[PDB]
Design a protein around this ligand. Sequence first.
Ligand SMILES: CC(C)(COP(=O)(O)OP(=O)(O)OC[C@H]1O[C@@H](n2cnc3c(N)ncnc32)[C@H](O)[C@@H]1OP(=O)(O)O)[C@@H](O)C(=O)NCCC(=O)NCCS
Lengths: 166, 166
Amino acid sequence: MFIKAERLLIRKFEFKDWEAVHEYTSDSDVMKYIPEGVFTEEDTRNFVNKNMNAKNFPVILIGENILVGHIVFHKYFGEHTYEIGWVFNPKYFNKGYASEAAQATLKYGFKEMKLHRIIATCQPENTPSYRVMEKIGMRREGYFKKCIPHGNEWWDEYYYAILEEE
Amino acid sequence: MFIKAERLLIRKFEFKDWEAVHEYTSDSDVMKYIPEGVFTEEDTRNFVNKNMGAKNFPVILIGENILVGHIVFHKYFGEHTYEIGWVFNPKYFNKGYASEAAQATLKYGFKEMKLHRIIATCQPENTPSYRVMEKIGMRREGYFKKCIPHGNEWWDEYYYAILEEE
Ligand SMILES: CC(C)(COP(=O)(O)OP(=O)(O)OC[C@H]1O[C@@H](n2cnc3c(N)ncnc32)[C@H](O)[C@@H]1OP(=O)(O)O)[C@@H](O)C(=O)NCCC(=O)NCCS
């Protein structure tokens, strides 16, 4: 997959990417909702290596050629419905890179891959996540209570969707 | 070669081109798949001087008058079969310049030089390179496993070709 957006591009991982990924995958605040939790350096290398059946795609600032996060994008229901997500370096929080990248991924999915539907989920506590989802045109279709086991707790989930027709 | 395309021209090197070439030949991301790896300033000067006679030809943006890369074009098998390649400045990637220049070179080779065949090679990992090959009409004819010695490592190679009839 290769997508060119306005300030950024989305491409497949290269091994050298791991260092920039580790800047945020080692961050307990960034990784708060990821079930695997924070990554060691070895974890981040294995993550990058596994995604070179790729489901995660780095987001690169064009010009500076700096890795600012990654897009999660994979089959969800048949081959017609995919799931999208993202993890970004909090350094760039105010720049709106997530919404740009996510929107460009929706465009690719619908226009180029001819998908029917794309979904995303997040915890109700993850305000920045569902705010991006809303900004790129996704609708909240579900609010599932105590549905996800996370350690010794059950977490809730908002479920968002967007159709190709939208 | 003097070749005019839509947005660019290809000509032979002048010595003062070396500084613009050095901008990318000193870049280790640019020269990752190039056997030499990164050039020193003396390496770039030597390269430009050697190709003033010529197997490498700068690509100049018309109007802006900016050297954005070079085309590799030289005899491969007798005088009837040539090899083509390309090395460009990352500031100008993903605008279609390499493909535009390489398309124009093929046309010159077949129409004006009356060549029979033109080939190109690259590593399978070098996605933009084989995408140029495909875009300009070349066919993948080979996939050679562990054939290229790079240090004490062995790389794979894709082999592409295009014929006069195509
Ligand atoms: C190969 C090179 C000359 C291409 O230059 P360029 O002007 O960006 O090439 P173009 O814009 O004409 O085409 C590049 C194609 O690759 C695609 N591309 C670029 N990066 C990509 C990536 N990481 N993954 C998938 N596709 C990619 C582009 O989308 C484009 O295809 P498209 O037009 O169908 O979308 C340039 O990347 C380069 O100089 N590389 C370093 C030197 C090198 O390795 N030379 C080749 C040795 S064989």
